[PDB]
Design a protein around this ligand. Structure first.
Ligand SMILES: Nc1ncnc2c1ncn2[C@@H]1O[C@H](COP(=O)(O)OP(=O)(O)OC[C@H]2O[C@H](O)[C@H](O)[C@@H]2O)[C@@H](O)[C@H]1O
Length: 488
């Protein structure tokens, strides 16, 4: 399955060659004892009020502060090695094809500095179809982001202060993961309620932010690569070019970035007729859904989930229990066949990675409408030759994210929780607008420590670009410095 595990070594131009070269000198931040003190103080200095206060560090039991200290040092941003090539190609593309507004931002941007831009320049909240937003600096509003990065952008929505839709398209491929304490079971309606003497709460594990495909904004983000529409998929906008056909405009070079990221052609309207294998229906009757590009986008995210859980479980010498949510299948779902592509691609990447998942024990698909998909069914086993437990258990049922792993079948495993995030929002998203129970994003920030540990304004040492980790199927999960040393 795609992407291939071996035979890789990304091509990289001279431009991306050097920026990855300069990453070999990025010092890996080392954790200590005063990590909690900086988080506690910077959390009090955060200019925005939390949705709930119970997830704050100072309200956790002091006997657990030593473990929370290690959890602060365990946080890092994370991208696929596939995405690393795209980031470097994007920087190169913006360096030459950027307008007068974009060029002062993107040139001389190191790789790690671009990741840092994708972390700090997010809005606090950024949701709904009309783009309701709240910035960390306090400004709020709705809409107005399509102008960001152009000649007629208006403050406070300027490229130097917020992200453009081109940035958000790449930020959707950027994840943040960390060990975490679980404040409550993590049901959607938890709203930060704490039951101090509960008997069913797995209190610590791993939390990983996954971002689905945003498909409802026309001509923007994953719509550009997955939905084949009349207005967008034209020859004048870069669509329909061959592999080595050189791009001579900005639109052609932008489409080249994504043709070569997904390793497939894009399509002009009319070339794609629904065959229900690569081309399926969308919600617009006159559009066409690219089932292949949707699979490859989910494939990238699933590699990050499985390789990250395998690294966390390997460090504590345990087996990973991955609580898998359907990111992009909730309020962001756009095709009825997305969930089938979701689970088909998940099982594909589980078999393709294979022995690279020797420390993954169980995959739990929670809140999915499909109950069986190929080898995936409740209680099934994805056979992997050489696996310590002969394979990976599959469970398909509604489950609270932090429900205690009390069963003897799962006793002592490392609970790895995925949650549906946003590329242009801090952990919780609408959590920062006092909406605590509307999505899995806001429910997670009410039940874990992501609002501080996955916050680049609070956990400044370990949640920055200088701590970027690369999920490579070949080399595992490594810090950006070690990945650069081992591929250059
Ligand atoms: N009550 C529920 N309990 C548990 N899971 C549920 C529930 N209802 C739906 N699900 C499943 O929860 C899963 C995820 O649904 P979502 O949380 O919308 O995620 P997305 O990726 O679609 O939308 C993310 C955007 O919305 C946020 O604001 C972000 O910040 C982004 O802006 C699906 O399988 C649902 O069926």
């Amino acid at each position: 399955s795609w992407p291939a595990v071996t035979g890789d070594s990304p091509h990289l131009t001279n431009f991306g060659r050097k920026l990855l070269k300069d990453c070999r000198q990025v010092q890996k931040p080392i954790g200590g004892y005063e990590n909690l003190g900086n988080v506690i103080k910077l959390s009090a200095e955060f200019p925005l009020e939390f949705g709930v206060n119970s997830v704050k560090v100072y309200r956790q039991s002091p006997s657990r502060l030593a473990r929370i200290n290690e959890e602060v040092a365990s946080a890092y941003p994370l991208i696929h090695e596939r995405t690393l090539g795209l980031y470097l190609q994007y920087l190169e593309h913006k360096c030459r094809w950027g307008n007068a507004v974009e060029k002062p931002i993107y040139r001389n941007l190191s790789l790690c500095g671009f990741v840092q831009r994708l972390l700090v320049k997010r809005c606090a909240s950024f949701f709904a179809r009309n783009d309701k937003y709240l910035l960390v600096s306090g400004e709020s509003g709705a809409s107005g982001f399509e102008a960001v990065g152009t000649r007629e952008e208006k403050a406070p929505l300027v490229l130097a202060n917020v992200l453009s839709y081109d940035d958000i398209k790449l930020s959707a491929l950027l994840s943040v993961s960390s060990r975490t304490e679980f404040v409550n079971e993590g049901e959607r309606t938890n709203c930060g309620h704490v039951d101090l003497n509960t008997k069913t709460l797995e209190r610590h594990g791993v939390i990983v932010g996954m971002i689905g495909a945003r498909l409802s904004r026309r001509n923007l983000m994953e719509f550009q690569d997955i939905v084949i529409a009349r207005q967008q998929n034209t020859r004048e906008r870069g669509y329909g070019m061959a592999l080595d056909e050189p791009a001579t405009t900005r639109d052609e070079d932008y489409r080249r970035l994504w043709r070569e990221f997904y390793a497939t052609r894009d399509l002009i309207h009319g070339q794609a007729v629904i065959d229900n294998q690569r081309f399926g229906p969308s919600k617009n009757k006159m559009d066409v859904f690219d089932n292949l590009v949707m699979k490859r986008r989910y494939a990238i995210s699933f590699d990050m989930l499985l390789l990250e859980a395998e690294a966390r479980a390997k460090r504590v010498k345990k087996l990973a229990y991955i609580h898998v949510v359907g990111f992009g299948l909730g309020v962001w779902k756009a095709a009825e066949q997305q969930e089938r592509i979701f689970m088909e691609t998940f099982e594909q990447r589980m078999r393709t990675l294979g022995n690279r998942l020797n420390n993954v024990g169980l995959v739990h698909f929670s809140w999915f409408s499909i109950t069986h998909c190929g080898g995936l069914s409740n209680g099934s086993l994805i056979e992997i030759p050489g696996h310590p437990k002969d394979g990976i258990r599959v469970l398909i049922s509604k489950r609270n994210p932090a429900r205690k792993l009390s069963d003897p079948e799962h006793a002592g495993m490392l609970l790895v929780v995925s949650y549906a995030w946003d590329g242009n929002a801090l952990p919780g998203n609408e959590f920062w607008m006092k909406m605590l129970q509307s999505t899995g994003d806001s429910s997670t920030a009410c039940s874990t420590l992501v609002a501080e540990l996955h916050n680049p304004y609070i956990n400044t040492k370990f949640c920055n670009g200088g701590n970027l980790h690369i999920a490579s199927p070949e080399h595992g999960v490594l810090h950006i410095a070690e990945y650069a040393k081992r591929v250059i």
